[PDB]
Design a protein around this nucleic acid. Structure first.
Ligand code: NA
Ligand code: NA
Ligand SMILES: [Zn+2]
Ligand SMILES: [Zn+2]
Length: 327
DNA sequence: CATTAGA
DNA sequence: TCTAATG
């Protein structure tokens, strides 16, 4: 956790770079299990030889380890860190819409800088355009203070349209987070469940709504169950116009909201932990459901869930307020 | 791990 | 169709 800190750190830098700059999946894939194994290893690694004892730790990796060990550095790192083509790839990637594929690609043409990205808007697709467009606003953390106003709003129109519209702003803000990266609206309605062959318009109405009011400024993407957008608070009595907020709204079968709500909220650890437990209690927990286990190794039979509660009850646990869904 | 663009 | 990108 801190005993094998650097070791894992460099391993990750190292892993990462393979996978981005070079399209070296495997080397990258190497750097990770190692980076993974060595993480756990309950003893302060003092030589590569020691590491080497490890599963996933080859000769190349340890080579590095010792090097890191001796000199509080690594050449491959100093070289990478330094190197432009690489620096540029990691950079550009920051644009919403820009993964490493396109990243390398642009570089190849020489769109290393941001301005580059500008003169080359033709070269960019829709998302990527909006990426570039709210480049700053996107890097920006969302103050709860605003999460509340937004949420506020979202709730009304959700309502103004149909009263059957059940909606939850999940995520960190759900667990009292003082800020968030983007607001996530978990949405379902009674007419939509496991069975009833969809009803695309259910998601659609609402997109149109928030939009009709100006909350939704743009379309990052929009499917029949998932919509990814840009939103923004009515820049008031002016002199202070709101930053464009990243937003996501997802339509759900009502019959499987909660496991999904549970899910969406996290944290990852409460999850994995809540997830670890269900199993003991003789169950199976998923991004949408909870099934009973059957000694035959496994089982099925998706249980009836009427609240974040029921699920707990199931695995018979203490209801943990979202606020304390911390770990 | 699943959903959406897009080519 | 696959292949990228988000989450
Ligand atoms: Na080994
Ligand atoms: Na990106
Ligand atoms: Zn020890
Ligand atoms: Zn989100």
């Amino acid at each position: 956790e801190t005993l094998n800190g650097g070791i894992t750190d460099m391993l990750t830098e190292l892993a990462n770079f393979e996978k981005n700059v070079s399209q070296a999946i495997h080397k990258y894939n190497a750097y990770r299990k190692a980076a993974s194994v060595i993480a756990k290893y309950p003893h302060k690694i003092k030589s590569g030889a020691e590491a080497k004892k490890l599963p996933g730790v080859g000769t190349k990796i340890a080579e590095k380890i010792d090097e890191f060990l001796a000199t509080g550095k690594l050449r491959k790192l100093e070289k990478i860190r330094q190197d432009d083509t690489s620096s540029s790839i990691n950079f550009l990637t920051r644009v919403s819409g820009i993964g490493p594929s396109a990243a390398r690609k642009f570089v190849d043409e020489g769109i290393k800088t941001l301005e580059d990205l500008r003169k080359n808007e033709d070269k960019l697709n829709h998302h990527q355009r909006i990426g570039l467009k709210y480049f700053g606003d996107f890097e920006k953390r969302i103050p709860r203070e605003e999460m509340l106003q937004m949420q506020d709003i979202v709730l009304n129109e959700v309502k103004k349209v149909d009263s059957e519209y059940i909606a939850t702003v999940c995520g960190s803000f759900r667990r009292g987070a003082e800020s968030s990266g983007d607001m996530d609206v978990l949405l379902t309605h009674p007419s939509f469940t496991s069975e009833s062959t969809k009803q695309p318009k259910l998601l659609h109405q609402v997109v149109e709504q928030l939009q009709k009011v100006h909350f939704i400024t743009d379309t990052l993407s929009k499917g029949e169950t998932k919509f990814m957008g840009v939103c923004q608070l009515p820049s008031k009595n002016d002199e202070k116009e709101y930053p464009h907020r990243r937003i996501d709204i997802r339509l759900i079968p009502k019959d499987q909201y909660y496991c999904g709500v549970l899910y969406f909220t996290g944290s990852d650890i409460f999850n994995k932990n809540m997830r670890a437990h269900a199993l003991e209690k003789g169950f199976t927990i998923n991004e949408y459901t909870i099934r009973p286990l059957g000694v035959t190794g496994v089982a099925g039979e998706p249980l009836p869930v009427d609240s974040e509660k029921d699920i707990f009850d199931y695995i018979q646990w203490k209801y943990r307020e979202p606020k304390d869904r911390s770990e």
